């Protein structure tokens, strides 16, 4: 199937409390593999997956040098943005950056991205052609002009179409056992009365990987709208999710739960029986 590599960076100012917090994490698909936290003891990029531990000191020194550079850039950005928006020094603000690449089943480049947000909203993003920018507002237009003048896009494009993909392939190979796997969901249903006339049917999907999954409820073959929780991590590398519907007692058989997941030969149909 397809695969992705993504780096997420969060920088948060701490008014009157010194230096901003900086956290960076790297993921291949839904598996985290590296982290850096300005408040941690090492002050180095650290491994978070067994397959990345085999990388040598040159890798770790290089990653640590680059993540620190990222940190430094974001530290400056916080001040610049507070300036662009003429915000006071009293409040904490947040900068977030995400970049990475996707490859198809043949492991060839599919798409790249580099998005930046300020206080939880889009600020500036590279367009899918990787040659132009989308600026959120007037202030971001200033950064857009600056990055166009400096040819930032061609630099990110070279990284996103080359380096990013090359390393994603390397990681997929080195961590083949855990990254190129699919764990089909273990499914079941529960039934609990809500009252003397109604019951909640809950369709459960557990221990699955990757995280992408679709749980749908149908009543006599027709989609229903039902409660769904956000897919959540089990903590062991797999995920969990459930979907529920309230039905009139006695009509349970009119309902079916459908589960779709790349680890499933064909979609599952569950019924309370």
């Amino acid at each position: 199937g397809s695969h992705s590599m993504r780096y997420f960076f969060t920088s948060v100012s701490r008014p009157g409390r010194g230096e901003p917090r900086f956290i960076a994490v790297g993921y291949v698909d839904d598996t985290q593999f590296v982290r850096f936290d300005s408040d941690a003891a090492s002050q180095r990029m650290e491994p978070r997956a067994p397959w990345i531990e085999q990388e040598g000191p040159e890798y770790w020194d290089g990653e640590t040098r680059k993540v620190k550079a990222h940190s430094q850039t974001h530290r400056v950005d916080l001040g610049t943005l507070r300036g662009y928006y003429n915000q006071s020094e009293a409040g904490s603000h947040t900068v977030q950056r995400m970049y990475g690449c996707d490859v198809g089943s043949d492991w060839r480049f599919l798409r790249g991205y580099h998005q930046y947000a300020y206080d939880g909203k889009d600020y500036i993003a590279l367009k899918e052609d990787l040659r132009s920018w989308t600026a959120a507002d007037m202030a971001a237009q200033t950064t857009k002009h600056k990055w166009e003048a400096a040819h930032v896009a061609e630099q990110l494009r070279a990284y996103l179409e080359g380096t990013c993909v090359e390393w994603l392939r390397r990681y997929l190979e080195n961590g083949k056992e855990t990254l190129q796997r699919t764990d089909a969901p273990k499914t079941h249903m529960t039934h609990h009365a809500v009252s003397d006339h109604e019951a909640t049917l809950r369709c459960w999907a557990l221990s699955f990987y990757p995280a992408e999954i679709t749980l749908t409820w149908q009543r006599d073959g027709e989609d229903q709208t039902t409660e769904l929780v956000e897919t959540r991590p089990a903590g062991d590398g797999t995920f969990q999710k459930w979907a529920a519907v309230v039905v009139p007692s006695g009509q349970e058989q009119r309902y079916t739960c459908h589960v779709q997941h790349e680890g499933l030969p064909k979609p599952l149909t569950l019924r309370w029986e």
Binding site: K66, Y123, I124, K146, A150, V152, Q155, Y159
Partner: peptide, 10 residues
Amino acid sequence: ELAGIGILTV
């Protein structure tokens, strides 16, 4: 691996 180019201040 992290980008070594294209990361510039806003």
